Every structure is written in C-alpha cells, then in structure tokens.
Design a protein around this nucleic acid. Structure first.
Length: 244
DNA sequence: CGCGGACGAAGCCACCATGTGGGCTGTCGCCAGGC
C-alpha cells in the first residue's frame, strides 16, 4: 500500500486510541495490468485512467449496477458474467453491486454510495415465463439503460461545452442532477410500460423518452442565460446536439 | 529576543414532437278596505 497505518490499541483491546497514518514508499511504481473491477477510460494522449465516481449518478439510486444489462466493460465481469465462462444457470441469478467513492484525487471528498441491481428487473422477466415477451422486456430494459446513459454523456458534454463557450463548469452539476432526477421515473415507466411522456407503451425501444428529459433538464439549467443573443446562439448550438 | 502569524512544500489528471379554462348577488308603489 501507498499508505501505512499503525493503530495503537486500548488495554482491553476494545477500541483504538491513537493512530499513525504515514507513507510506506517514496518511489511510486506502475502497477502492472489494469484492475478488473474498475471501469477504465483512455483520453487524448492515450493515457489510461479509471473513470472517476460521480455523485450525480448516485442521485438515481443504483444506476451503476445496471452495468450488467449492457462498449467498455470491466474485465472481471466480462470473464465471469458472460457465456464463454462455464457455469450453466448461475448466470441467470447473479446480480451486480458497486461501491463508489466520489472524491478529489487530493484530500477533498464528496460522496460515497453502494448500488446493488434491483431484483425487480429480472424478476419482472420471470413473472410471465415466456420466451418472447421476456426477451422483449430484457431488450427494452437494456435499451432503456443505453438511451439514458448516451444522453447522459451527451448532456454532460453539452453543458460543459456550452459553459466554456458562453464565457469564451457549474452548468454540468445542476444539469446532471436534474437529468438523473427526471430520468429516473421515466426509466421506471419505460420498464413497466406505464405511460411516460416521450414514450408509447409497447414501442420496440426507448422511443425518445430519454432525449426529452435531457432537453428539459438542459433547458432548465441554461434557462435564465439564454437571454442575450450571443450566449443564446451558443446555448442553442449545443442544445441542438441533444436532439438525436 | 521571543512569539505569533503567514506562507510554502506537494500530490496533482480529458433530419421531425405538442392541447386548456368556470362562483357571486339583492327589492318595492302607496293607500285604503276588508277579512
């Protein structure tokens, strides 16, 4: 470990009284091979780093554990969860859990959250017990998740690009907060097939349901600043990208 | 000369979607006759 701890005991051993947190190494070493658990990302210059936790995705409880219904995927999951592996039925009832600690890479810290996948999503598939309405449920759910995330990144980059341009960002924080808060019930309406705006029950896919929520959150955030024509032109150039 | 305050030292990671509404008020013609 990069950190070295020593805990001074209480005489009974019931508690710790003092603690020493200090370095064990002066020279850092590259740890060989990427960590299976984390989700990685490559960025211009080609450097590979783990995707940071975001407390905005924790606003919608348990969104990361929906990772199973899926581009880039953690290797441990991609070895043990799929069908090349070896178990027979086990894979049907496995369910994913994630521990995320969103914080600064320095000493500031913001939020942590656990996230087990809901057992309702797979159990709603077995209530029926048919090959087709079930594969269609699973297809819908996987489809819903894909739409919500693609427009989550589209909306992050939208707000981020617009904020930088408008001043020649704080818009991203409220953008994502509003996004997942509004995008959470529309997802659960798409799964149950209940009627959600931007969606028609029984449609083959998400149906633009998600693209509408992103536009409403974005327009909710950039709303007071689309007044001046110069800034309004920038904001419009970047909301247009969320039109899909 | 001593004490207190301020500053510094890092580790730092990127082609096309939108519909709604309903709750607050007062008036004569006057006089006389009959029941």
């Amino acid at each position: 470990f990069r950190h070295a701890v020593l805990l001074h005991p209480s005489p009974d051993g019931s508690h710790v009284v003092d603690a020493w947190v200090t370095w064990a190494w002066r020279e850092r070493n590259i740890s060989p091979e990427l960590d299976p658990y984390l989700i990685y990302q490559t960025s211009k210059e080609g450097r590979v780093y783990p995707r940071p936790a975001e407390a905005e995705r924790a606003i919608w409880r348990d969104l990361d554990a929906l990772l199973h219904y899926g581009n880039y995927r953690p290797t441990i999951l991609d070895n043990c969860t799929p069908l090349a592996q070896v178990p027979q039925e086990v894979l049907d009832s496995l369910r994913l859990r994630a521990f995320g600690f969103d914080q600064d890479g320095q000493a500031r810290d913001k939020q942590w959250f656990t996230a087990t996948t809901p057992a309702v999503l797979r159990w709603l598939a077995d209530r029926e017990t048919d090959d087709n309405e079930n594969a269609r449920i699973v297809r819908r759910i996987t489809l819903a998740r894909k739409a919500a995330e693609a427009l989550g990144r589209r909306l992050e980059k939208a707000c981020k690009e617009a904020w930088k341009e408008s001043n020649s960002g704080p818009w991203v924080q409220h953008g994502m907060s509003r996004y997942w808060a509004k995008a959470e019930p529309v997802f659960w309406n798409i799964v149950y097939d209940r009627p959600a705006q931007g969606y028609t029950p029984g449609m083959a896919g998400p149906g633009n349901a998600f693209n509408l929520v992103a536009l409403a959150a974005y327009d909710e955030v950039t709303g007071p600043y689309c007044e001046r024509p110069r800034v309004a032109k920038v904001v419009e150039r970047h909301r247009s990208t969320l039109f899909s």
